Amino acid sequence: TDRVSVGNLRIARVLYDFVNNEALPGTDIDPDSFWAGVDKVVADLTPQNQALLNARDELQAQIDKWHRRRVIEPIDMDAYRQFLTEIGYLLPEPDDFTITTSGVDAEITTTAGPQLVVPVLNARFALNAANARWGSLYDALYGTDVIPETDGAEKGPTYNKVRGDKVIAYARKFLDDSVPLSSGSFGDATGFTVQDGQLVVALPDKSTGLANPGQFAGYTGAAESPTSVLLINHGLHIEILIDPESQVGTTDRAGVKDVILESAITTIMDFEDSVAAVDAADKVLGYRNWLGLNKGDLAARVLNRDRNYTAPGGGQFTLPGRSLMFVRNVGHLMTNDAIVDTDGSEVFEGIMDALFTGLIAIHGLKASDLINSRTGSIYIVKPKMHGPAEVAFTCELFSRVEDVLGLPQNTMKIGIMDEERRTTVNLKACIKAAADRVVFINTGFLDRTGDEIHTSMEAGPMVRKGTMKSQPWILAYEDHNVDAGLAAGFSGRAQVGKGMWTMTELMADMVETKIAQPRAGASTAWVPSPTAATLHALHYHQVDVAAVQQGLAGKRRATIEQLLTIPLAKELAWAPDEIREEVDNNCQSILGYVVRWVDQGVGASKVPDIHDVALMEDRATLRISSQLLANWLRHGVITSADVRASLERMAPLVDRQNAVAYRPMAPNFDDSIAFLAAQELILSGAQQPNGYTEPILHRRRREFKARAAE
Ligand SMILES: COc1ccc2cc(C(=O)/C=C(\O)C(=O)O)ccc2c1
Ligand SMILES: [Mg+2]
Ligand SMILES: [Mg+2]
């Protein structure tokens, strides 16, 4: 056995060596004490971890049996609520309180802006994400459909000046609405200068200053013909680049080359739903990337240095060139044979992630041969928790890891995903359980939709997938999340965050509708690319999030009844063509994701749906699709033959979109491990714990790896 014995643990050699040779050096942590602590923590906390998972199962069975023993319809919310209280699912709401989290960076406590999520196993994506703190607006407008590709303005192989003018004019309007001139418009500016520490913009027939001179933040170059002008609005920086001999500047009335936005303020390096990591070799690749990110030396293309500026008065100052980094550990469910005990049982992956990503994170608190958290914190997102006891356990785990790492208590801060029903309905108690550690709450609406379907599996058939985004339960869930955060003092102390935009090509749609999120008081929301970060940043220049949160203080906009409104489909409701479309749509989504998961170990993939729209699919959207079909199969909406036919229908189409080093599924379907994984996720969906996809995915990916080795 390629394994190392430490107490009761047998550690995969590749992981043991990585930690000893790469992660421990520079921490001043004694290697023997670390591994002894690994062993101690795993032995102490595994039972409670397991008890919690059994409790999920106890609760789900009592709820299953509750729906089964009643034909009365539609519902007796009074009865259902009393039952949830009786069985300990719905707990008493504690008294009001204010969080006490301290030692947090300004990007979290203060700044409102985009938050980018990226798979940590892909080093190149992770580098671009960390560098996405600044992004070119002209590139993002020219490259996407925010400037429509109408007649004459489409993208070709070389610069289309008609299109670029549209981009320039779009950016002038943005500047006008964000940093207004005293009189006149940026559209007519001819140049910029600094005089007596003030920004002076030259118009055709006069000159003007800023309506708020305080929005002038700095410049580069000679004051009397600068190379760039730096502005701030709503805590976010805008940089106007001036270069008339550049390609775009030659055509511009003021020589303006580009407009740079402070874009992804923070970034979440993901070990969970956007990655596939089923053994020690996978986790080591992830850990190694997370290590180079914190040491500053990851290269695939390198990390950016900080940005240098001249203050208005004349001094020098610096701005961060990198996004402040979070890490998303896996949650409490899965184990991983990267470590096994003497009976051969796998160790809980979440316990491992806290020990190892926390150890690695120490490097980001010290100088890189230039830092992540200047205030001494480690920022871990914790997903897929169910209720305050599960939150308390995470807090205890962090305490024990801090002790093993020699770290001050409460160094390891937690971003609470609100993406499971038992957390939503006890949200205040969950925040209280982490009152000294919590740095955000975030509505992970995709996982939350999966948990909604699974929890009420037995109640009846659910509405279609596309219908879910506007059901009553989800809008109350969204508002109740903001209310609980604001009520716990998150304003000025912690982030209130919302959901991912998954239509990577529908960027005009994103600019037009994602504005709802800061309008609802969210200080941050999730984007999947640096491009999307730059464009989403526009919404924080239009909406004053701090003032919005102020106006919501004390309001109570969601009742417990509304939260508990199950998304049951009404009588009739669907025609045959609509039932067929939803089945086809779900099967292709599942197939396209799973085939790259199982075969190539890619945890996030662009997959076109039945309407040919490109969706960024990850494990959460997979949880929704499989659970929805499982629920339809369970209540007689469709038959097992419909599932099989739809899967066999869509598989050749997926094979075409991948034709790469790719193994087709058709025509020998039952010989493709990926195809059988898709089938299994639907047919066993109702039996997976809380509808989770990781058991089946991890098993099938390991099965595939084993075949590829003989
Ligand atoms: C590179 O493209 C990506 C990367 C990461 C992603 C992460 C999520 C996600 O995790 C959503 C939630 O947690 C929740 O709704 O439950 C969704 C789409 C993603 C797409
Ligand atoms: Mg999620
Ligand atoms: Mg304003």
- Identify whether the C-beta of residue 46 lies closer than 8 Å to the C-beta of residue 396: no
Phi, psi angle pair for 593, to nearest 5°: -70, -55
What was the resolution (in A) of this experimentally determined structure? 2.1
Dihedral sign, CA of 438, 444, 447, 450? positive
> What SS3 state is found at 627?
helix
* DSSP at 568: B
Best residue among 327, 616, 690 to mutate for probing ligand 1's pocket (most ligand atoms within 8 Å of CB) is: 616
- Report the b/e string of 374-411 with b at 16+ CB within 10 A: eeebbbbbbbbbbbbbbbbbbbebbbbbbebbebeebb
| Residues in the chain that come right before a backbone break, where C and next N are over 2.5 Å apart | 300, 369, 659
State phi, psi for 325 to the nearest 5 degrees: -100, 130
Which residue's alpha carbon is nearest to atom 6 within ligand 1? 274
Rounded to 5°, the CA angle 668-613-642 comes to: 40
Q: How far is the CA of 170 from the centre of ligand 3 (A)?
A: 19
3-class state of residue 513 by DSSP: helix
One-letter amino acid for residue 305 of the chain: R
Closest by CA position to 268, among listed 371, 417, 100: 417
Give the Å distance between the CA of 543 and the centre of ligand 3.
7
> Which parts of 296-426 fold into alpha helices (H)?
349-361, 388-405, 421-424
Residue located nearest, by CA, to atom 2 of ligand 1: 528
Set out the domains of the chain in order of their start, with CATH numbers. Answer: 1-133+263-569 (3.20.20.360), 134-262 (no CATH), 570-710 (1.20.1220.12)
For residue 42, what are the contacts with CB-CB under 8 A and spacing of at least 6?
Answer: 8, 9, 339, 347, 348, 351
Q: Could you give the angle at which helices 31-68 and 445-455 cross, rounded to 10 degrees?
A: 50
Alpha helices by DSSP H, 333-387: 349-361
∠ Cα 247 250 254 (to 5°): 125
Grouping H, G, I as helix, E, B as strand and the rest as coil, residue 135 is strand
**Nearest ligand 1 atom to alpha carbon 383:** 13
Q: What CA–CA distance (Å, rounded) separates 501 from 497?
A: 13
Residue 346 Cα to ligand 2 middle (Å): 24
710 C-beta neighbours (distance < 10 Å), count: 4
Q: HSE of 455 in the Cβ direction (CA atoms, 13 Å)?
A: 21
**Closest C-alpha among 201, 269, 228 to residue 136:** 228
Residue 623's closest CA among 383, 405, 398?
A: 383
**CA-to-CA separations, 498 to 109, 114, 115, 501, 523, in angstroms, rounded:** 16, 10, 10, 10, 9
Residue closest by Cα to atom 3 of ligand 1 = 528
CA 43 from chain centre, in angstroms, equals: 31
With a Cβ cut-off of 6 Å, ligand 1 is lined by 117, 119, 270, 273-274, 419, 444-447, 499-500, 502, 528, 604, 616, 618, 620
- C-alpha dist (Å) from residue 621 to 223, 411, 500, 593: 52, 33, 11, 9
